[PDB]
Amino acid sequence: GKAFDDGAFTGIREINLSYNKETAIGDFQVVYDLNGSPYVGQNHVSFITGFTPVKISLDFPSEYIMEVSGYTGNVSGYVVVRSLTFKTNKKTYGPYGVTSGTPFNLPIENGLIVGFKGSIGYWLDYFSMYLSL
Amino acid sequence: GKAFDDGAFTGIREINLSYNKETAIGDFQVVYDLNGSPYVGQNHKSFITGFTPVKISLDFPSEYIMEVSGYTGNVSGYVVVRSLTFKTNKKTYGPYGVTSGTPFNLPIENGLIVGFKGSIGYWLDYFSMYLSL
Amino acid sequence: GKAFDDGAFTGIREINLSYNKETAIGDFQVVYDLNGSPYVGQNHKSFITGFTPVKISLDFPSEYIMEVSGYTGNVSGYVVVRSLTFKTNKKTYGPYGVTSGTPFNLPIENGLIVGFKGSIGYWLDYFSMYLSL
Amino acid sequence: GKAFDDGAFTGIREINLSYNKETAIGDFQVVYDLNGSPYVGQNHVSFITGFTPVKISLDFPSEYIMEVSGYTGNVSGYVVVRSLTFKTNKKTYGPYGVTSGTPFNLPIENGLIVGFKGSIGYWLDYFSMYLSL
Amino acid sequence: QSGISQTVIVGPWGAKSS
Amino acid sequence: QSGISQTVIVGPWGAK
Amino acid sequence: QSGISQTVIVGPWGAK
Amino acid sequence: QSGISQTVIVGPWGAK
Ligand SMILES: OC[C@H]1O[C@H](OC[C@H]2O[C@@H](O)[C@H](O)[C@@H](O)[C@@H]2O)[C@H](O)[C@@H](O)[C@H]1O
Ligand SMILES: OC[C@H]1O[C@H](OC[C@H]2O[C@@H](O)[C@H](O)[C@@H](O)[C@@H]2O)[C@H](O)[C@@H](O)[C@H]1O
Ligand SMILES: OC[C@H]1O[C@H](OC[C@H]2O[C@@H](O)[C@H](O)[C@@H](O)[C@@H]2O)[C@H](O)[C@@H](O)[C@H]1O
Ligand SMILES: OC[C@H]1O[C@H](OC[C@H]2O[C@H](O)[C@H](O)[C@@H](O)[C@@H]2O)[C@H](O)[C@@H](O)[C@H]1O
């Protein structure tokens, strides 16, 4: 896929992603907060289409992500992120996608997710998260 | 179980833990680095015995943990940590315990594990990690 | 004066300020680095004119500030920042303004200045700096 | 003089120093907090004696340093720290020593002092501070 | 704030706490 | 805790 | 060392 | 990097 690195910001205001009930996560874009002002991250799109879009508008700054979990599995000979779930101090968003394969979860006791980086070809190949206080 | 919180330090020199191939992880103790000197943390022990001891001596500071993974699962009606594996930039330690249940893993791209906290009853009920630059 | 708060960024690429050889520091603006891209901060201007502009262009990221110093004094009944000097690992910029009053200086052994905040009326009333690793 | 480096800790519980109103600061020792427990730092003594001891006991953790200020200047041919003052969110301790020479001050809007390093011969030659969130 | 230093904490893994 | 990231801030210097 | 600020980064999860 | 933790350090004040 085509790699991307959003970098680190002040917080997260909204997550826009798309998925397919038969494959994995497609597109991924984040609207961060930059010192009190919304900052629209670049839109990392899949090479193909046919995905179901989802918009997660957080009630920033009172609501924030406390845990990110999901599944990585095989699709067409590729290991990709098949599903994602976001739990904030107010609600749980997801799961989105297919919960098959190998699970993983990142719960946070103290600190915030302030940025994303990864790779997307047909589907989300992999991703990392920036953490800060 | 009884909760513990070692706190944060400047690095990790050695880890001592015990496990049982039929249950889960039992005792947990860490020798941290505190500004260049070894600081021996308290030994957090299981309410019972019969575990196999293991000592992880790191070649500090050139050797450090890059990823922690393991398995959580049911044992006697409780959810506990059944296995742990420590991967450094020089070697892999483990897995230690029963590799059965739900897997989890925490790869670190940039940063360091500098402390532990958790709870231990008959077995390690759960644990968290302090991360810093 | 009118308070401002640029917030925190990834680094500093350029500093534009103006001064008057008889009073104090006037306008203040910074071109920060945001995850590898230049980001132009709001220009914080004096309520009056007649200042001499100064552009401090840093060779980012190999060149960075190591110490900020200056003088705070009374001007027409107000305590303001009368002078500033920036020292990087490559050279010294300044002093700019009037080197008279009470001196202050902040040397950094480890870390970076990643943001500025303050207030500007006829002159720079005061300012703080954001530090990070 | 003889250089020293205490390193970084969790907070400050007590500061013990000595001075001479007609010369400069002599001895310096700190009782730090290390994850909820008191940690007695090494005592950094002056090559000579005849100073006035001072104990600064802080109501930890509700009380903490917000500003450190003082003066530097000569005593014979050497440049040293002649005076120090410690302002917390509850009281002001000092000044201690010769309040003359070149002033310096470090106010803190957000963050904490968690360590000290420096040098002491007959008097405190110089010092630095560790800052953290 | 208080006078206690803080750092990022990830976890916990195992029995649920929240 | 809010969803706003924090960093160390030193100052201010100048008027009070 | 570098004039670039840094942050803790965890991951990646997915393809190696 | 190494296995040693870092912190911001301001200073020194006094002799060079
Ligand atoms: O996102 C996973 C994967 O997507 C791209 O390749 C997958 C695509 O390759 C074609 O050659 C096959 O015919 C088709 O069946 C596959 O779906 C991307 O090029 C790859 O690196 C990886 O990101
Ligand atoms: O570590 C798991 C679990 O350990 C304790 O409970 C297990 C077991 O402890 C024995 O002392 C009792 O006789 C028996 O009735 C209990 O089932 C602990 O109490 C529990 O909270 C949990 O940590
Ligand atoms: O702390 C300042 C200074 O202390 C030592 O030097 C003190 C110096 O003072 C002279 O007036 C005396 O005659 C002589 O005996 C003493 O050595 C230290 O040597 C120096 O590096 C510096 O730290
Ligand atoms: O920068 C110092 C100071 O500047 C301003 O005060 C100067 C004059 O500003 C206005 O013209 C006002 O009409 C006059 O009263 C005043 O003398 C500012 O208002 C101050 O708060 C302060 O920033």
Side-chain angles (χ1 to χ4, degrees), chain A, chain B, chain C, chain D, chain E residues 2-17, chain F residues 2-16, chain G residues 2-16, chain H residues 2-16:
Chain A
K2 172 185 160 77
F4 72 89
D5 191 346
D6 281 352
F9 292 83
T10 305
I12 293 171
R13 286 175 175 266
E14 171 188 300
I15 300 301
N16 298 290
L17 63 77
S18 70
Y19 67 98
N20 192 296
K21 288 172 56 187
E22 309 230 70
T23 52
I25 299 165
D27 312 309
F28 191 71
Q29 181 200 55
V30 181
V31 174
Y32 303 90
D33 179 62
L34 181 56
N35 304 128
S37 177
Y39 187 93
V40 181
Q42 170 180 42
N43 181 37
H44 314 299
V45 283
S46 168
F47 293 169
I48 60 168
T49 58
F51 293 105
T52 304
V54 179
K55 179 183 292 292
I56 303 167
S57 297
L58 308 180
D59 180 33
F60 180 83
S62 57
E63 172 182 30
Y64 53 93
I65 296 300
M66 288 185 86
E67 181 180 3
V68 179
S69 57
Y71 285 79
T72 60
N74 195 91
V75 183
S76 291
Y78 290 105
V79 175
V80 299
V81 178
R82 304 201 67 181
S83 175
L84 280 175
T85 298
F86 299 93
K87 183 171 182 295
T88 75
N89 54 319
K90 289 183 180 180
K91 310 168 66 297
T92 294
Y93 304 83
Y96 299 116
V98 184
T99 56
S100 179
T102 302
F104 73 85
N105 68 310
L106 178 72
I108 300 79
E109 281 199 29
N110 196 216
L112 306 160
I113 300 169
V114 293
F116 290 95
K117 67 177 294 190
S119 173
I120 295 170
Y122 267 32
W123 306 288
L124 183 61
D125 303 310
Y126 59 73
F127 75 111
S128 299
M129 292 177 268
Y130 289 74
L131 299 178
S132 168
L133 278 175
Chain B
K2 183 188 177 185
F4 72 91
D5 185 358
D6 283 343
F9 297 76
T10 58
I12 299 166
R13 283 161 178 277
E14 172 182 291
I15 299 77
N16 295 290
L17 61 71
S18 56
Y19 65 94
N20 189 302
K21 292 188 293 65
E22 298 222 279
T23 51
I25 300 299
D27 311 303
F28 195 73
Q29 196 271 160
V30 182
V31 176
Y32 305 93
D33 177 73
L34 181 61
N35 305 130
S37 296
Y39 179 101
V40 179
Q42 311 177 191
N43 185 37
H44 311 295
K45 308 188 96 294
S46 164
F47 295 164
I48 55 169
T49 55
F51 301 98
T52 294
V54 176
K55 177 187 294 295
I56 318 299
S57 294
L58 301 179
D59 186 27
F60 184 80
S62 57
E63 174 177 41
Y64 54 87
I65 307 162
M66 287 178 78
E67 168 173 29
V68 182
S69 59
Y71 281 88
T72 62
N74 250 64
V75 174
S76 186
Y78 302 104
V79 182
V80 300
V81 181
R82 308 193 68 187
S83 179
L84 285 174
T85 299
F86 296 101
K87 181 175 181 173
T88 75
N89 57 313
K90 296 183 176 182
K91 183 184 183 176
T92 297
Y93 305 81
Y96 300 116
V98 185
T99 52
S100 179
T102 304
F104 72 80
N105 68 144
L106 176 74
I108 299 74
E109 195 169 305
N110 188 52
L112 298 170
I113 299 74
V114 300
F116 295 90
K117 61 179 290 188
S119 177
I120 302 173
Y122 261 32
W123 305 286
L124 182 58
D125 306 306
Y126 62 72
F127 79 106
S128 295
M129 294 179 268
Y130 289 73
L131 302 180
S132 179
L133 284 170
Chain C
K2 187 180 200 300
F4 70 89
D5 186 356
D6 287 352
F9 295 81
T10 304
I12 303 168
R13 287 169 170 275
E14 172 181 294
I15 295 168
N16 298 287
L17 66 86
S18 63
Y19 65 90
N20 181 94
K21 69 177 190 174
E22 284 191 298
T23 51
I25 302 297
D27 315 310
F28 188 79
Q29 193 225 60
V30 185
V31 174
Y32 302 91
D33 177 76
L34 184 65
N35 305 129
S37 297
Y39 188 97
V40 189
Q42 304 302 296
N43 188 356
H44 313 293
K45 315 189 67 57
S46 168
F47 293 163
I48 57 169
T49 59
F51 300 95
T52 304
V54 179
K55 180 188 293 297
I56 307 164
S57 198
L58 300 172
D59 179 31
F60 180 81
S62 55
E63 173 184 28
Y64 55 94
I65 307 298
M66 299 200 303
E67 173 176 36
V68 178
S69 62
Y71 290 77
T72 54
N74 187 296
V75 171
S76 293
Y78 298 100
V79 174
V80 298
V81 180
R82 311 198 65 175
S83 176
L84 283 170
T85 300
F86 301 91
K87 175 183 172 181
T88 70
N89 56 323
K90 293 186 177 186
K91 77 240 293 182
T92 297
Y93 303 85
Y96 301 113
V98 183
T99 59
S100 183
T102 307
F104 68 84
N105 74 298
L106 177 73
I108 310 83
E109 283 199 17
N110 194 218
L112 301 167
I113 296 166
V114 296
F116 288 97
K117 60 177 294 186
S119 168
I120 298 171
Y122 273 19
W123 307 287
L124 179 59
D125 304 309
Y126 63 75
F127 74 116
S128 293
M129 300 182 264
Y130 291 69
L131 302 172
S132 179
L133 284 174
Chain D
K2 185 178 184 176
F4 75 88
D5 194 347
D6 286 347
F9 298 80
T10 307
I12 306 296
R13 287 171 175 280
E14 177 181 297
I15 302 299
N16 297 295
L17 64 69
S18 64
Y19 67 101
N20 181 307
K21 71 194 81 301
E22 292 309 304
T23 50
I25 295 157
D27 311 306
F28 191 75
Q29 186 273 322
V30 179
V31 177
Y32 299 93
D33 178 68
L34 182 59
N35 301 132
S37 306
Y39 184 90
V40 184
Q42 184 190 306
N43 191 185
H44 309 294
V45 291
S46 166
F47 292 173
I48 54 168
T49 57
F51 297 98
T52 303
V54 167
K55 183 187 291 294
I56 302 76
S57 291
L58 302 181
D59 184 11
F60 177 78
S62 59
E63 175 184 32
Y64 56 87
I65 301 167
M66 299 194 305
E67 174 169 35
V68 172
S69 59
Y71 285 84
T72 61
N74 304 249
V75 169
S76 278
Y78 308 100
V79 174
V80 301
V81 176
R82 293 184 184 164
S83 175
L84 284 175
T85 297
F86 293 97
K87 180 186 177 188
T88 70
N89 56 313
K90 291 187 174 185
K91 311 182 181 188
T92 297
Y93 305 80
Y96 301 119
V98 178
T99 64
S100 179
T102 305
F104 79 79
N105 74 136
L106 173 69
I108 311 301
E109 277 200 18
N110 192 46
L112 301 166
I113 299 168
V114 298
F116 289 92
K117 58 173 293 185
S119 172
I120 301 171
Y122 267 35
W123 306 285
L124 176 61
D125 304 308
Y126 63 77
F127 76 118
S128 302
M129 298 180 261
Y130 289 73
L131 301 188
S132 180
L133 283 172
Chain E
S2 81
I4 312 169
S5 175
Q6 57 179 174
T7 89
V8 170
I9 312 312
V10 299
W13 285 278
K16 196 144 70 172
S17 299
Chain F
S2 62
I4 301 170
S5 178
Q6 290 182 305
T7 109
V8 173
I9 314 317
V10 296
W13 281 286
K16 184 56 185 297
Chain G
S2 184
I4 313 167
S5 171
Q6 53 176 177
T7 296
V8 164
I9 305 169
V10 294
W13 281 280
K16 186 60 178 298
Chain H
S2 60
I4 312 262
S5 178
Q6 289 189 60
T7 304
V8 167
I9 303 169
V10 293
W13 285 279
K16 66 195 65 178

